Design a protein around this ligand. Structure first.
Ligand SMILES: O=S(=O)(c1ccc(NC(=S)NCc2cccnc2)cc1)N1CCCCC1
Ligand SMILES: O=S(=O)(c1ccc(NC(=S)NCc2cccnc2)cc1)N1CCCCC1
Lengths: 471, 470
């Protein structure tokens, strides 16, 4: 069973001996720190953490003893605030005396702004604010996945609109392939849910249950998939029978969209000779609602996509849309799902546009790039103490390392506001109390063991929309 | 509760309809596919997956019903193999009819060798082998953390040996700071455990319970930490009282080692004037078993470490060890825990060596670099079907994409062997049966719902030792 007393960085066990004596309040904040691009971030994921790990009775006698036992061996020493944890158990029935205020989930906020704050609500528990830094900071992951996914949606939107004149089906243009490529089952669920803030297409099934349990949607599920082959289901037919494999699969899935990986042996032969000739008659007969999607999966992503389109364009009746771009017949599409990340995505759609191919023809799948190839320093997600009360006097605190101004932290009690021009500003040093900048956008989401404000996944999606969708 | 029917890539739900008719056997293997860095990998982590996710009754009526209902909406259609999963429920009390063979955990194996194989043990369950691909492939993560961690140990061993003449304390030279910097609590435990294959220092507490539950050690815990400050415990004192914080902290932890982050405002002032002058009397009085560890945390990692050492070297009595390298007194050490990954680790120790500073003086902490900044394509960890039986005939299968020879997969039934020169070789096409290369080195680790072979964490550590250690 999960034990919050064992869910922190080891050294934090020792911090109650280190703060100034007579400290009654430790107040800390989280930001995606600005760096001398990712200029705005999607705030998403805290609600999962609050419900799964922080709310309710999270301290018991048994958990205190278990922690005591582990730390004794781990430190080879008795450092451990047993009295501190006992207090929480006795006074608050094991509920955390903490208040957390946060910007609404889905909000899109420029770098360098307060996203949430944390403070103890009982003077005895000054040490608890930063005990839970470690667990709260892990919100960097769904923030970064949601943000990186949204940035890719921006690229797709721009090129889809330019080459086709609209944004139809944009929400299905980037599919989550990342399940096998992440570091754990829990990560899979979290990462997949964050991608679903921006898109509807996913094969990472774990995301669905997480959304259902922690956020909720009006619709039965937040994400969808389609039948698709893998190399095993083609190669199992044997090298000489790729055509048989292709024919069997498209016939089994005759009335729904189906994707077929076509690069097992020779992607170009597959497109030109197998799909383009031998099996052409099984393709041109398909419904617009059930296209064949040809999937290359190797080689230079841009070069391969262009060559595949060139091949298909000569075997199938291509049209020219109102924007002047080439368009495959509606029963035929392509998906590139190898080596796609935000950089290569950009390179492919720009390459397609140069060669006069509509973005309508293509979709993208991304695995490692979408859910795993990300770190906390991408957006500099960071949690820092900015205000303490010692001997009844509040003081504004911060770090400001001499060799790295990028690492300076904010001072005092913080609040987030709309500017007169409608942008965002974070007020420091309790200046939000002057009430010159309207209402604080941070809301109490957690207080004394209770989740006090929640958002549906539908609300979050609304908050995270692109401007171009809004227009 | 975990549901194995909902723990695969969506498209695999539809694969039982795509294999050739009358397929009775699907046989697949995992390798860290070949194609000068990372020439060998540490096999670690499969045992966790087998025990947590795959063994025992993993199928129930409720789980089948749940999966059916989810996939109906997810595909907007009925494609779920309800009958297949019901078969496993009724016939095997929900135990998976699968056999898995693997190299022992902790083994160090060159790239491009079979590490484990999976095949169905019931003809009705041909589809099951690749259903579980997604969960098994996640073994890439502990494999990769363990391997990258071990490669860093190799660098540290080399330079520690060169600058000091021995390897004393090597297993504490790279400390895991990665807890806040990974993607989840589960990943924290897995990754931290993987680092502990090679080292004993960690602040990622989640790794301890994982090892205790899934692997086991003779010792009470597999990993250790020491008291240390963070920025909040220094800055809380106010900008004008940095000295007061340092004094309080080292006095609270007077007889155990203690690290104190010293760069809140000015690392060089902290080292030269606060530690080096004002509080010097509290440092030189400390025990060899309870040093102060000064911790810079910003700026260019190599430049900062060198300047910190030069500062301390002028304020404290430095000696010269038998190898001719400079050594701080035993009550004083440094730890660099910012921007450390395998590349910068190399740069720092090399730079220290060039300036005649012993590696004894320094330790490293690594967070994101150790546990998060890693992907499945670093070692090309990959799972592929190599052998099927259809209509009672065995067929050797593989992929071989024309534009990428690096993606070619192995053919047929696989086995792992020792060569005459004592190396590893992977035999394909059932050739291990020819018995020209002795016994298959893979062991059956899972069969029909049961874990059939397992390793303690102590054995894994032994298997993963460096040559120089041996
Ligand atoms: O976007 S689409 O072209 C589209 C087509 C096919 C797939 N699925 C694929 S390629 N799965 C293969 C796979 C799965 C997991 C991991 N690695 C590979 C997704 C999306 N599409 C959506 C809406 C209806 C029309 C067509
Ligand atoms: O290797 S050591 O120098 C050494 C010193 C200090 C720490 N801990 C530190 S700096 N924690 C700070 C921190 C924790 C978590 C995340 N981010 C930062 C580890 C190791 N060491 C070991 C053996 C006995 C003597 C001394």
């Amino acid at each position: 069973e999960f034990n919050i007393l064992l869910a922190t960085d080891s050294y934090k066990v020792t911090h109650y001996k280190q703060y100034p004596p007579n400290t009654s309040k430790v107040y800390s904040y989280f930001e995606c720190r600005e760096k001398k691009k990712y200029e705005e971030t999607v705030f998403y994921g805290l609600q999962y953490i609050l419900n799964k790990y922080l709310k309710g009775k999270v301290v018991t006698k048994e958990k205190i003893q278990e922690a005591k036992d582990v730390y004794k061996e781990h430190f080879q020493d008795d450092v451990f605030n047993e009295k501190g944890w006992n207090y929480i158990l006795e006074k608050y029935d094991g509920h955390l005396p903490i208040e957390i205020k946060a910007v609404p989930e889905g909000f899109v906020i420029p770098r360098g702004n307060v996203l949430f704050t944390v403070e103890n609500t009982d003077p005895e528990c000054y040490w608890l604010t930063n005990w839970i830094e470690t667990i709260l900071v892990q919100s960097w992951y769904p923030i970064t996945v949601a943000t990186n996914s949204r940035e890719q949606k921006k690229i797709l939107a721009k090129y889809l609109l330019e080459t086709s004149g609209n944004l139809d089906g944009l929400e299905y243009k980037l599919h989550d392939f990342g399940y096998r490529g992440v570091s754990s089952q829990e990560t899979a669920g979290i990462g997949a849910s964050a991608h679903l803030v921006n898109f509807k297409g996913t094969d990472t099934v774990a995301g669905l249950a997480l959304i259902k349990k922690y956020y909720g949607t009006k619709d039965p599920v937040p994400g969808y998939s389609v039948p698709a082959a893998e190399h095993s289901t083609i190669t199992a037919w044997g090298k000489d029978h790729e055509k048989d494999a292709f024919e069997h699969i498209v016939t089994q899935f005759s009335s729904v969209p189906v994707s077929v990986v076509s690069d097992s042996y020779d992607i170009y032969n597959a497109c030109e000779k197998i799909w383009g000739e031998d099996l052409r008659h099984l393709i041109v007969s398909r419904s617009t609602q059930a296209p064949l999607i040809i999937r290359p999966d190797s080689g230079n992503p841009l070069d391969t996509v262009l060559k595949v389109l060139e091949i298909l364009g000569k075997k199938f009746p291509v049209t020219e849309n109102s924007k002047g771009y080439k368009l495959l017949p509606p029963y035929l599409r392509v998906i590139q799902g190898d080596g796609v990340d935000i950089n290569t995505l950009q390179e492919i759609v720009e390459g397609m546009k140069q060669k006069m191919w509509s973005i309508e023809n293509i979709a993208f799948g991304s695995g490692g790039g979408l859910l795993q190839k990300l770190t906390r320093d991408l957006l500099n997600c960071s949690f820092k103490c900015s205000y303490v009360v010692t001997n009844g006097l509040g003081i504004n605190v911060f770090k400001d390392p001499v060799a790295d101004p990028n690492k300076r932290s904010k001072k005092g009690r913080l609040s987030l506001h709309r500017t007169p021009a409608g942008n965002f500003v974070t007020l420091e040093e309790g200046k939000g109390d002057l009430e010159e900048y309207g209402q604080d956008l941070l809301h109490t989401v957690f207080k004394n063991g209770k989740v006090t404000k929640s958002y549906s996944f539908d609300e979050i999606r609304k908050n995270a929309q692109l401007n171009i969708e809004l227009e």
